[PDB]
Description:
The protein is mainly α. It contains two helices and no strands. 69% of the residues lie in helices and 0% in strands. The chain is elongated, with a radius of gyration of 19 Å. The chain starts with 10 loop residues before the first helix and ends with a helix. It binds one DNA strand through loops. Belongs to the sigma-70 factor family. RpoD/SigA subfamily.
Amino acid sequence: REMGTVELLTREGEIDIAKRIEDGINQVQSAIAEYPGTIPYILEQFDRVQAE
DNA sequence: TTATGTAATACGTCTGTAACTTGTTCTTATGTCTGTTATGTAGTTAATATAATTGAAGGATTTTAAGA
Length: 52
C-alpha cells in the first residue's frame, strides 16, 4: 500500500531527477571551493600523487 | 706377704658406612619470534526487466470484551 502510491517514471523523469542530483552536487562543490583551506588540500594531494 | 703375670672387662677410638648437601654440567621441554600460505572480507558489474504466497480444512463447549 505504501509503495503503490508513488507513480512510475519514464525516461525523461530519470533525466530530470539526475539533473537535479548533479545540480545539488555541484552546489555543494561550489560551496566547498569557497574556503581558503580547501584548495591547498587538493594542491598538496596532487603534489604527493604526482611524485608517484 | 707381696711382686708378678695372666685374664676378664669396660671404655675410648680409628676407621668404614652412610646421610646431608652443594657444584656444575649436560640435556630437554617450552615459549617466543619470524616467514609464508591460506582464509576471510569487500567492491563492482550499464540491452530491460517495476503490488507474494502457500496452504487448509467433520470441534465442542464455555467465558468475556467490542460493535450495534
